Design a protein around this nucleic acid. Sequence first.
DNA 1: CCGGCTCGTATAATCTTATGTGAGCGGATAAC
DNA 2: GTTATCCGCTCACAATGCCACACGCCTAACGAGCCGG
Lengths: 90, 1339, 98
Amino acid sequence: ARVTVQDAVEKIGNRFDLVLVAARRARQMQVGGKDPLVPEENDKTTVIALREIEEGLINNQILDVRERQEQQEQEAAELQAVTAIAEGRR
Amino acid sequence: TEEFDAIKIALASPDMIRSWSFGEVKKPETINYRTFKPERDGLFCARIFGPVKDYECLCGKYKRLKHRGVICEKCGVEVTQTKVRRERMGHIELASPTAHIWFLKSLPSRIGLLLDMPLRDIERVLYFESYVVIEGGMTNLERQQILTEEQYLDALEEFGDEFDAKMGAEAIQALLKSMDLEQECEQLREELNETNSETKRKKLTKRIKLLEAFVQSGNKPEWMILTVLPVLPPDLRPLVPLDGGRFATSDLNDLYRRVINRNNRLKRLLDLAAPDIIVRNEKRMLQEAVDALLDNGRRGRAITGSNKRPLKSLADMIKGKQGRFRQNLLGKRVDYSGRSVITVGPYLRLHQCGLPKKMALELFKPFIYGKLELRGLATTIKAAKKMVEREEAVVWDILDEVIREHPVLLNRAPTLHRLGIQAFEPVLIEGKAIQLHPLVCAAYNADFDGDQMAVHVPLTLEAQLEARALMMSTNNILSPANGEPIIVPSQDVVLGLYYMTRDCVNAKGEGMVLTGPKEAERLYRSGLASLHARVKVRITEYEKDANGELVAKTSLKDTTVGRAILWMIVPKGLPYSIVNQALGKKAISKMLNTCYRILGLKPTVIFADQIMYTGFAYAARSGASVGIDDMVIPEKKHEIISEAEAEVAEIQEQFQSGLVTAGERYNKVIDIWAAANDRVSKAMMDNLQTETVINRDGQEEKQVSFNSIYMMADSGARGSAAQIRQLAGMRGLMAKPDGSIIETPITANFREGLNVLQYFISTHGARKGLADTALKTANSGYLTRRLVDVAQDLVVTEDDCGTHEGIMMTPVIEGGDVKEPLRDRVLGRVTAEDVLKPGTADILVPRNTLLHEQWCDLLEENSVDAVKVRSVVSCDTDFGVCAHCYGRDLARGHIINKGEAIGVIAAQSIGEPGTQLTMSSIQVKNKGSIKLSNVKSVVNSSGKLVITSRNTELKLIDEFGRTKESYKVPYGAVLAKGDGEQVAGGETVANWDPHTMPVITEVSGFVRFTDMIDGQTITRQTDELTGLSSLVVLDSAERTAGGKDLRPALKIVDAQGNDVLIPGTDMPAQYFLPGKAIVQLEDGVQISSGDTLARIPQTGGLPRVADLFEARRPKEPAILAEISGIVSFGKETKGKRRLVITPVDGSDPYEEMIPKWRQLNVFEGERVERGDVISDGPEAPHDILRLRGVHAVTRYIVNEVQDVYRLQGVKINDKHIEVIVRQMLRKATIVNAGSSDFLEGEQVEYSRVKIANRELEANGKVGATYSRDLLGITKASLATESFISAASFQETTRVLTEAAVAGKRDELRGLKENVIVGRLIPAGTGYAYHQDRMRRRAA
Amino acid sequence: HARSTGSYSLVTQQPLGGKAQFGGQRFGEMEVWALEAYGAAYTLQEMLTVKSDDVNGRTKMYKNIVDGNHQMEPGMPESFNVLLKEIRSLGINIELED
DNA sequence: CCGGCTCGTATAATCTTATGTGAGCGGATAAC
DNA sequence: GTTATCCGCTCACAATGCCACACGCCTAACGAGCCGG
Ligand SMILES: [Mg+2]
Ligand SMILES: [Zn+2]
Ligand SMILES: [Zn+2]
């Protein structure tokens, strides 16, 4: 479980970037199906999101870098699928 | 729809109404109810509005989903959903045109202001009593001339076919479009350029601003009169289903039935060539019926059968406490909620609460359904419903998986301040009540007397995460109103900790020696040594003066077993001298506060928990009861009352002989009963506090007692000296409700019995206090409502405005003690300028830093008296407040983040403690430097010091330079000392006469009489019992007409009889004489340097704060000085007395009037600087603003409101009152026209003027000149650009009329508008939303 | 007294009040001032729109919870459209731009 | 054998312990 | 004289929030119905 919040507000900027960044991380962890970095302790996604914030492995720059990287890999992989279709046609 | 910007409003055209509607209602009957099909072309219908059931014709032809769109012909009904029944309007085509009731009777009459015609004339035109003339032409008569039947008949004799005169609504409709719009504007602009009279210019600027706004809109003067009236979609005024027979009707349906019946009857009367009298009467009936439909209040007439209440018109569905702004668009009822009674439960931690098991199964039903269908234990939703209605044993494990990290909001009903709702985690309880952690209970201000609380559930992902971060109860320690912890341990924990840490001089194990604190615990448990027996122990303590780490130190200290036990829960940081004292309430409060300062957040929370646990444990092991032998009566009460009775009998006999009057008899009796009450109270307190004598192992000693109620008062748990005084000593003096205070005080206490009369007397004060509370609640609620209406649209929006203005703070001193020091006021506000060290040209503070606490001490050490600091009222940012202009935030630590909605928390911090409110010589006291400010004095012949300056001020200073004390030294008084004369305390340094105004001279010689004639001006009055006959000089008005035109004057001459000039100038100061001027040293009598020539005789509760924030004008204000110059009286009784003040270089056009009844201060040869008092009394802040600048009204408001809050011990920080002052002076008038398009008399918000001047100054044009206004808070709310934010507040009707005429357009910026619409707020999290949207719009 | 999902009123699509009629609590005006006084933004949006007066929003939310996905759909409250339809019943044009 | 009775239902009428504001408008009011 | 002000009279508009509970929300006479005397 988790009681305090003040280990994150001194890591991310204020008490308002923390809400949006941790909500975005928990939303892509819950439904998008990604595996968490630190191990769970049978907690919910909000608490494990705040834990990954306060240790310092999830940040807004880091979220946009990872999303850009995996999305570029996604469009590159479907371009590879299109070139595989082009190999299969001719 | 979605994705929509600003809301637009304008009038509604008849062709727009025909674009809206979907059919014409013709029949006034609702439904047949033989069968319950609706009647065709009734108020309800199916061909007009929509289908009765879903996807079905009324005829009952097409019943299938794959037939959508094609209408029937059996019923003419489009097969669509019944939601269409909620959204299609209807129209009625009227027989006669009809005047709208709002535009007639908004009272500024829009028709009357438009046509330049009084309202009562238009009223007796519309209600068929007169005629108007419409283009009379070759006629004696004019246009707007109105007639009666007799002038109309005589005109029909005279000009029988020339004039065109009608009546009723058609006549006004004819006059409206017959008028042009451009010609009226240009003609009246030329007439205003040809006009100097003021009131005419007021009315004409109103009329041309009306016309210019009316043309710059889209609309027309035809549209104020109705022709086609629309009706509401009939699901939105539904017909009430009763049980047995008929259906109960609404109010709107009865009003529409009445209108349609009247309309059909008039249409048939027009169809049959009716005579003129009957159609006039019928048109009057229809006009009155539409006036009854739109707003029933202007003619309070429409009342129904068996219930003689006014029916609810359409305007009554918007205003009030039940219309759609206050009722349904702000406070909506909310699913996933619950209510219970509460209960303590002292085993909880701070971040959790007790939740009933059954109610928690009831709340979280969809989460349960999802967890069941995840784990394969069900397949459908109905299987899950059966499983959770059987309450099988798997469901409780599932519910415990649902709870675990999912917080819950709790609420208490009369929410005052923002700690009212807080979020906890749940702990399941087999019970039926909600358990609640006891430290939080002071923040809710909750009883356990039956107080009920409520529960809401955050259910999305962002709401869970906000309730964990922003709102969990471990994140609210300090209060937002003032930086003090709100987690003070309450009454019972106070009693426990106070009983643990004391001492008594002989107990078990006294004077032994110990190893740790844990050995002292092991001695307490075994019963070997008692809890408080003095003992030397060994303690290790850690001190973090090393820069980021801990230093151990081990010593032996003389302390107590209980103090060694309490030391085991103190964390590493604090020194041992925090738990060595007796530890009452304020001591443990500052214990928590120092633990917060030194260590952080998490040890503060866990330390408050350990304090609460051990305080309850040792309060249990105390056994502190109360009994009837714990209230010690004094032994000396009886003879004190006997001596008081002897003294009142002696005063009664001195009144009976006739020596002393009745008022002094009253005063002597009340003084001696006050003294007797004080002596009895002193005796009982001295008998309680120290009676406990105990054997030392020598003879005897004295100590503080272990009595029960003395521990309950001395610890500060419950009670004061007053309540424990009424329990054993006699009780006070009860005051009768007339306002007087009764002769005989209540001689008895509560331990003895009260007899009949004394209890009957005490009932007065009981019922008075109860009624005062009962009304005080409502007044505080209304004032809080208005303040949070004012300050809502204000958000900290950018970082650094970067200016170099501000205010100067000095610690406030009344003349008694220094009330607020410089440390408490200017803790945590960003410095304006670099305040220099007293060592000159040494930068003590940089000009743009934050006064934190250590820095505040290092500013305090050099004894700084005035610090300049940045306020909010001079912050530069348009549409918000910069961050460094507001400083650090309360309730947290650092500077404030961009978005904190500070106006709302400020209005809550002022309005929260409003329930707690209610509804001849200068004597120095200490030794220091004696400074006199604005002093200009001279020593007379007799050694006294008379001052020739009014504004002299006394400053007692220390050796440093800081002000110790201050007083006000009057003009020309009896001064025991001079300037700079180093004297000591206890000294009466001044005196004057409150019945003698100084008419002191400037030179020596004689005083001669110019125009002072006995019988014309002056009178010779002989004091009949002394022998010194003197002269009495009145003013011009009090004497008769023989000296009305004469001006009596004591001409200041020498002993020769000639005017000696003033040293410094060349002006002879002859002394013209005001009224009640007793001239003693007459002509031929030598005078001195400044000698007395003529002797001249002369709220606080919550409505004070209410009448101050309204800024309403006080009665008989203080006349100030407009600009400096020589004073000169003038003509008498042209209404008032005239006065001309001539500048040194400029002209003197202003010739101010003064009621000669009210007194005056200045003299003729005297000249004063601008903004200076003339007649004493109260002050309106308007004058203070327009004369002494902008910061002066802020200082006046802050000091007065802060006096009213310091009277009751309520501590509210100043920046909240500053940011309420900023929202009061936001409008502005314009003095010139400027180079831009702004008119002269144009009231306009300041920030638009400022950006206009910034844009013009970017080029090389000239700007405009503005005078900053100051409005009341209700006037500032009611005049806002957003016409929604003024519609939700009071008087929605007038705001909607003015906004609909002007055709405004509301951008939807601010908090209240976006709450109404229902998107994200632009304040908290969602602020980061809106500017992310805003850069999307501009790019 | 408690409620997860109960009945609704006729004119405005709000839940009813009281214990007997299976109602929800009045999250009144002063509590909205209190949530504005924090930095709470999304929670005010649920207490204003998803919990009441957005019909399609609340049924989408209920299905979305049972499916196990915590999203939300903002929408627009039906009571505001009620307010528009009885201002248009007077002679006052009022629309929404864009 | 139409409405006298009897009913379905659509729709008209002779207070009187309050306060405090502001805001406007009609009647007196003091000048070249 | 006539004009620009001052003052008294009259009238619209506001007055906390929540809870439970409980009982109330037409009819003498104008268009139809039945069938007796
Ligand atoms: Mg209570
Ligand atoms: Zn049909
Ligand atoms: Zn600023």
